[PDB]
């Protein structure tokens, strides 16, 4: 019985460990998600993958998952492993609300899940999750927040990050076009359609190929709005009008 054990927990002789690096190797391919904020509001831009002509296009979202009443997440990686995590921190936020009668702060929801994710990399002889995912949300302590999880179990706060297939190309351009605290929730939308114009090799930016959801703070609402397919393409062509203007005049 010890001949068949694969030892998914031990170190390697060079010091690092192989199992989560194979998972973060798989997190590169198969998906593209990004977020941005500088002011009132925060967005999640995600690219759809299965664009076959025979699907029902239901469940209000594809890679966006509403977690709390004022925060949501975008996921990347193995989709079946994602469904277990998404309905796991969904009731971490509810057992907080049962205990304190107050909505959960957005940061310590991430730390609670990233401790469950860390435990499989550390004992049990168990396959870790090949899932990395984003976090938007609002709380009264710091306002609009943006986090990023990794399959190793370590998180981080950010301002704009992509976990796509060409995510290094996206990050290299996000730190080429940015402004700290002045990107309103229209310039960020124009910047969002600019970034996934680059990283998507399928050109011309099909409006059914991407999904965009915004979280804006209305007084006691915190409206999480998945914007429909009638206002994507007018935002698509708005990027197209200015690029023919800027190329010809230069």
């Amino acid at each position: 019985s010890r001949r068949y054990d694969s030892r998914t927990t031990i170190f390697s002789p060079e010091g690092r460990l192989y199992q989560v690096e194979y998972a973060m190797e798989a997190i590169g391919h198969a998906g593209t998600c990004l977020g941005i904020l500088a002011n009132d509001g925060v967005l999640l831009a995600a690219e759809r993958r299965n664009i076959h002509k025979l699907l029902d296009e239901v469940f209000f979202s594809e890679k966006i998952y509403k977690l709390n009443e004022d925060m949501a997440c975008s996921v990347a990686g193995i989709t079946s492993d994602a469904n277990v995590l998404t309905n796991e921190l969904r009731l971490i936020a509810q057992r907080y609300l049962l205990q304190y009668q107050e909505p959960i702060p957005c940061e310590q929801l991430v730390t609670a899940l990233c401790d469950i994710k860390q435990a499989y990399t550390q004992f049990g002889g168990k396959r870790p999750f090949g899932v990395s995912l984003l976090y938007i949300g609002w709380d009264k302590h710091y306002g609009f927040q943006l986090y990023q999880s990794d399959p190793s179990g370590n998180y981080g706060g950010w301002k704009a990050t992509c976990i796509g297939n060409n995510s290094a190309a996206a990050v290299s351009m996000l730190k080429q076009d940015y402004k700290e605290g002045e990107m309103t929730l229209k310039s960020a939308l124009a910047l969002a359609i600019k970034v996934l114009n680059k990283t998507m090799d399928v050109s011309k930016l099909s409006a059914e190929k991407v999904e965009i959801a915004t979280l804006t703070r209305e007084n006691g609402k915190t409206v999480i709005r998945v914007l429909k397919q009638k206002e994507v393409e007018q935002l698509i062509k708005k990027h197209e009008e200015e690029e023919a203007k800027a190329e010809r005049e230069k």
Partner: protein, 232 residues
């Protein structure tokens, strides 16, 4: 006794779960089956050939009902199918004892696919070797979902599972539109199962089940002979 308590499904150095990739090979070598929803109900049709004339075809069934209004077919290996049928029969009851309501078809696939994902990570087990097609008409609108041994699921308009499934999906793409009745979808489900069957497609080589707003039911071989007649 006891178990093994270690996962025998690990990540490859290329980042692919190899045992799930092998389980999809067993699904592709199964019996062909198609499923079509069209605007008032869903048609599930499969292909059941006994190996010889000695078998009693009225003994087992491919098309199974889950509740009053949910049916379920497969394309994979036999004995794995009857396990997660009896699992899904039970899951529809614990929803009913809490809420006093027939389960939505979406929430069943939420919980059947959660079993299959849980079964490909736990210790000492090989994954399932079946893929499913689930129908049902909840709140007027019909539904057609497909799961897989990995634990994911989709929302199809029309799809095919089994051998030559890549040829059926090209055939359904040139056939299906938004506007068909239930009896039209029956006629094009036999027309796509004729792509891969043998020469004789009789009243007992196939098995068809439908949903309406009247509920799920399974066709007897009398009217299956009438649909098989005047076909192709």
């Amino acid at each position: 006794e006891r178990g093994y308590s270690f996962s025998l499904t690990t990540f490859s150095p290329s980042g692919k779960l190899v045992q799930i990739e092998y389980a999809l090979a067993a699904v592709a070598g199964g019996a062909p089956s198609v499923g079509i929803k069209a605007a008032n109900g869903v048609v599930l049709a499969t292909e059941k050939k006994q190996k010889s004339i000695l078998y009693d075809e009225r003994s087992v069934h491919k098309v199974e009902p889950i509740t009053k209004h949910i049916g379920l077919v497969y394309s994979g290996m036999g004995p794995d199918y009857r396990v997660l049928v009896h699992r899904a029969r039970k899951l529809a009851q614990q929803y009913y004892l809490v809420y006093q309501e027939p389960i939505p078809t979406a929430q069943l696939v939420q919980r059947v696919a959660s079993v299959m994902q849980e079964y490909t990570q736990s210790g000492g087990v090989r994954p399932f070797g079946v893929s499913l097609l689930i129908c049902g008409w909840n709140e007027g609108r019909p539904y057609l979902f497909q799961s897989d041994p990995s634990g994911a699921y989709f929302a199809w308009k029309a799809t095919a599972m089994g051998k030559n499934y890549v040829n059926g999906k090209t055939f359904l793409e040139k056939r299906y539109n938004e506007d068909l009745e239930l009896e039209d979808a029956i006629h094009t489900a036999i027309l796509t199962l004729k792509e891969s069957f043998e020469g004789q497609m009789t009243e007992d080589n196939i098995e068809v089940g439908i949903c309406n707003e009247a509920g799920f039911r399974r066709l007897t071989p009398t009217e299956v002979k009438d649909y098989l007649a005047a076909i192709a």
